[PDB]
Design an enzyme around this catalytic site. Structure first.
Site, short mmCIF file in Angstrom:
data_model
loop_
_atom_site.label_atom_id
_atom_site.label_comp_id
_atom_site.label_asym_id
_atom_site.label_seq_id
_atom_site.Cartn_x
_atom_site.Cartn_y
_atom_site.Cartn_z
N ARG A 63 0.83 73.01 71.87
CA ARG A 63 0.20 72.17 70.86
C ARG A 63 0.89 70.82 70.75
NH1 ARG A 63 -3.31 75.92 68.33
NH2 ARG A 63 -4.16 74.30 66.94
N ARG A 67 -9.41 89.91 60.72
CA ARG A 67 -8.50 89.34 61.69
C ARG A 67 -7.58 88.31 61.04
NH1 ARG A 67 -9.20 84.47 64.78
NH2 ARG A 67 -7.83 84.43 66.61
#
Ligand SMILES: [K+]
Ligand SMILES: [K+]
Ligand SMILES: [K+]
Ligand SMILES: [Mg+2]
Ligand SMILES: [Mg+2]
Ligand SMILES: [Mg+2]
Lengths: 514, 516, 514
Positions: free
Chosen positions: B107, B60
């Site tokens: 964020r 991944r």
């Protein structure tokens, strides 16, 4: 729909999962008992009061540490924090006091700063008592005097949560030249495990005897006996407790390969069982622990005896306000498996977040409680004990089947010795079990069973048995009403005794809340 | 008995629990897929070769971080470590490459140059959108990416910072500013994740950046896409559209991370190739306790539909700093596979962790101990029950073969498949024996790792003229694999699923054969 | 919906019944075998041809009556009636020939008009051979020479279908003074039963030996051995058949209390079992017979061996064109229980309506066949033999599960010895089993299994195994097409052998009808 009642109608376990709705709110009751070990972080009366409010049911005392003066102060602080609610017996919550034995554990000496041990290094373990306060990267001292006669050449030694691995190269009188497999930092008093070895240490040493005897005079409700391997171990614990403490429950911690093999004889000898994943995880390969956990929880539910899932259920909460997702599913799986109680040890002893962890187990528990396939589990519990033709079990099975059908709000049980309510519990009703009593010891011990909400009746015994039955019932009605389990217009199942001399609870009533 | 075979004869699920034996040793094979996310700790070819040995199935790539150059290097390293084993096709293990989108994530900025600011209970924290504070975040001021935050957030609304460890309650609102009160503190670092439960963020599911990352995956030739923060079926279709004709074979795993994802799961599922249970973000949008309900709900529904379901996030989290897992983490992996997870994921344990190899080893060790502990007979009957309204021919071949493998306790199920469709169908009914899927198609081999039980083997051998010889060849190739891997020796019984002729469309012929 | 496919989806047996639709038409195939005893009413070739058309599969020959010249003519007439179809092997139906032994039965002598015996009268039974043709309301003769040494005082004696009851008052050398309990008319040669007595007569007498040996040279397919009580009985039958007739199936008739007790050893020793309700009904209390019938049918299905339900299934059809409603539900219940075959005895031997009774069993059978809960029955059949790790059973279970799923029209099995098709049958597919063979004896014996439609291939063996497989398959395809089981566009499951030297049928194909 409430309480996953749509997922309740599944008839297939696969289809049972698929229906589980997060929009489905649980009932206000919480069946799973929360056991908390009281350490420095939670020792004060101000904190211990808050834990009961947060959902503490049984307070564990670990006797691997501290003195007898030390723990007597802890037990005193529990009772003070408990009785500060007894002014109104309606809202009062019985809190049990538990004593956990040290057991035949192996520990280390002191360091001359935590000593670093490099991967693939040379080490030597000497049993000389002049090395008690002198340990480093080459010399180490242990408790086990007869270690050489049981340890073989090329054997693995695990020190401190099984994080440090060793392999014996040379064997001697009391010296062992060991090769490091995977090292790390090394402190003092760190536990040592020996997987694949016959530990011939006493089941109950003189320290354990005095730990247990201290429990008798301090009036403890139960005992968590450590490193049980057979039936003779449990018998010795009961032998030590004797006639003075025969009513004190013996919960048996299964921590080693031998305890797993001989579980059948240990369970019948004990009142309960503790799945000690922590130590078990080192004694048997760490990836096999889930197997045994389900094996033990299954048989304890089948035998109708309490089972506690313990250790590291919420570890990350020692240093963080939120658990991990692995810790969240584990606590749920523990109750989905069928465990009566869930234990916190270290999160409540040392952690920066004692309250959050108790509230967290309370929130997870009653979610997973509703997530159980009750009807399918009930049938299996009946099937498993279909040989038994007991009268109380018949009274229990009938009461639980009736609580499933009319979706009752609770089960009111008038129990003196506790034995009647315990039987209702072993057949897992979906609704809470309000078990009224006038025996303090019975009330406290009742938390070891899933579903039982014990209430101590502080009212005097009536002359006419019917009035004494009717006064205890309305009391239990008032408890559910106040705590919010039900209201007038709801329906409950009531288990009473027909006459004063009826051994068990033999009368079932479907009655609406007054 | 060997692999919990005593617990398999239980007839009662309670009996099944009571019969689980710790001294009952599992088989060699491990059915549950292992997804490793590759970061600093695992990025080297040398480290990557070891993980393949340790049993990594998927690699991944977290596109929340790094440039396009960086991931292109990660990809190159992974393919090199993979090709290192291509000298012997019998032993060769095909590893999948997965692209994980950034998606609409909020964020914070950077902290001033304590290095990490301390928020205290009851304290006030100002939130600003002014780009002059991009790197000037402290105890008094905070910066966020979401320029449109104040249009979706109200007074009283809870804001969560850094994996939901810091809680903020909105006290004053503005156009481009927020004044909040700290509910519970913690240290505040740089570029931390921000979650807004109850709020309806108007950020795009597929953004301008997301397109560039998805277009990059297509030319890089990724095998699947983990699509972050999918809320409805129209989100999936947009990723699908972006991938387009060139990316049509790239499977779409839809990450369920919010309350809306769960609500609309049905439409998301049938629109997706698979689903990922994103426990991390999921456990901040909805209460953490309710997460296991969603996990089980999703696994079950995917199992019923025959699509891959991945369990993800904080599975072995302690293995970042420690060489052994916690007990809760141990049982978490087990219960995920016992639920019916096609695959299990490691995020931080392999990306930043001190013990990447030990983490892949522990998952492999738990997984196959849990695959035997399953109650196969009962699960098979229920999966059959659920799909009885379908009368697909391939589904029957799959059911006959899996039933056949339970009876004669087959060691393996050999399947010859070109598109995977046939192997996927056998896997969905969950046999105990490993499924050896012989394929000449490289991309089919890599994507086969998404499905529980399928052991993909790539055949480099040419196409024979006679179909019967071509079939035998591929079966012979498969046989040697079992021998070499230790799945079975001579005398053992396997189930072979083949096509009768080239134009069969599916694996319509099933044989029971002994290993030569 | 066809074939009760809505009731097929039930998951509850109660809900399975509730869904049974009379508007739901069955499939054209009929799985349950019809066994017919050929007597005077059905003996002629003209009639025997019609019975095969009506649905006759196995012709029973009762050797309690007739000579060896007599039965040889019956067996000759069967084969003539059968071969008159062999001109076109597509439509041809194999017909098995069965031999039923006399057994150790007790019969009466002749009357000096049927003698009336009044309720509460005086009777005397003498074993003197001068009373063979002299019987009335006071004197009677029996076959059993050693009756006195086994009959006790106050014992019940049942004569002629158990309709006449007697009780012994006086015991002697060979005279028995008996009191009548319930009387009636009395003819000649009437059977006698002794319930609660140890009949020490031979299992196989010299007559039975010559009955069996006659079967060997006449080429019979199976034998229905009478009054079997243990394993030694079956062994003796096989011992008599020997190497010449080792392939002749031994079906064991259970007719007495001892045969029910020791069923486990008799079944494993036999190829099949016959529930002889007739005689059993006198030997054990008549109301317990349904218990044993289900006990035997259950274990025969579990063992994978043929079971025949026999006697009085359609009695009223001896004298009437329509059966009773009791007879209609019984035939259905026999197949719902799981019996492979249903027997007609007396309705086809003597009755005024031979054809109607065969057509009636055919109409009832395929209605009840569809009425079975296949999926739930299949799981139980798997569960029961889950210890067995057989290869052919695996091939069978897989093929049947695949026939349930895609709702296949049939199962095509290429079997030589029959053993492969028998295994498919024991797991009860819903669709018919077209079992192609080139062994005549195998084809005829195949009717003893529910579902198997045997077809004898009269085509020459091909050189290439694939062509020899492909030519037998298209043949089976043509049979289903012609008989109407399926058509082009439908789907079937095909069981072949991969290569010529494969012991069992090891290759499964899902193929559409060409
Ligand atoms: K301890
Ligand atoms: K991401
Ligand atoms: K007879
Ligand atoms: Mg311990
Ligand atoms: Mg996420
Ligand atoms: Mg008879």
């Amino acid at each position: 729909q409430t309480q996953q009642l749509h997922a309740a109608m599944a008839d297939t376990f696969l289809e049972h999962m698929c229906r589980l709705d997060i929009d489905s709110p649980p009932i206000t009751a919480r069946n799973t008992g929360i056991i908390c070990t009281i350490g420095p972080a939670s020792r004060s009366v101000e904190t211990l009061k808050e834990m009961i409010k947060s959902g503490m049911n049984v307070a564990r005392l670990n006797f691997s540490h501290g003195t007898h003066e030390y723990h007597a102060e802890t037990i005193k602080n529990v009772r003070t924090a408990t009785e500060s609610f007894a002014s109104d017996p309606i809202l009062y919550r019985p809190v049990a006091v538990a004593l956990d034995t040290k057991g035949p554990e192996i520990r280390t000496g002191l360091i001359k700063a935590e000593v670093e041990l490099k991967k693939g290094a040379t080490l030597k373990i000497t049993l000389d008592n002049a090395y008690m306060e002198k340990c480093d990267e080459n010399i180490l001292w242990l408790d086990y005097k007869n270690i050489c006669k049981v340890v073989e050449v090329g054997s693995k030694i695990y020190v401190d949560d099984g994080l440090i691995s060793l392999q014996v190269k040379q064997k001697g009188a009391d010296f062992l030249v060991t090769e490091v497999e995977n090292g790390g930092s090394l402190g003092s008093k760190k536990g040592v495990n020996l997987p694949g070895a016959a530990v011939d240490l006493p089941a109950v040493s003189e320290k354990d005897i005095q730990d247990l005897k201290f429990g008798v005079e301090q009036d403890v409700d139960m005992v968590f006996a450590s490193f049980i391997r057979k039936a003779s171990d449990v018998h010795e614990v009961r032998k030590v407790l004797g006639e003075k403490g025969k009513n004190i429950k013996i919960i048996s911690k299964i921590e080693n390969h031998e305890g797993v093999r001989r579980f059948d004889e240990i369970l019948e000898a004990s009142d309960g069982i503790m799945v000690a994943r922590g130590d078990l995880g080192i004694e048997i390969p760490a990836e096999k622990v889930f197997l045994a956990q389900k094996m033990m929880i299954g048989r304890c539910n089948r035998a109708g005896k309490p089972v506690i899932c313990a250790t590291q259920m919420l570890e990350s909460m020692i240093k963080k306000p939120r658990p991990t997702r692995a810790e969240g599913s584990d606590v749920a799986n523990a109750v989905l498996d069928g465990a009566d109680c869930i234990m916190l040890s270290g999160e409540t002893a040392k952690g920066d977040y004692p309250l959050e962890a108790v509230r967290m187990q309370h929130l997870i528990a009653r979610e997973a409680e509703a997530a159980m396939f009750h009807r399918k589990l009930f049938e299996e519990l009946v099937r498993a004990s279909s040989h038994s033709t007991d009268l109380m079990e018949a009274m229990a099975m009938g009461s639980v089947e009736a609580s499933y059908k009319c979706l009752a709000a609770a089960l009111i049980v008038l129990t003196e010795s506790g034995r009647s309510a315990h039987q209702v519990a072993r057949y897992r009703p979906r609704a809470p079990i309000i078990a009224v009593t006038r025996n303090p010891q019975t009330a406290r011990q009742a938390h070891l069973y899933r579903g039982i909400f014990p209430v101590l009746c502080k009212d005097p015994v009536q002359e006419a048995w019917a009035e004494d039955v009717d006064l205890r019932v309305n009391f239990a009605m008032n408890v559910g009403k106040a705590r919010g389990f039900f209201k007038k217009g709801d329906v409950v199942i009531v288990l009473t005794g027909w006459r004063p001399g009826s051994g068990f609870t033999n009368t079932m009533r479907v009655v609406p809340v007054p």
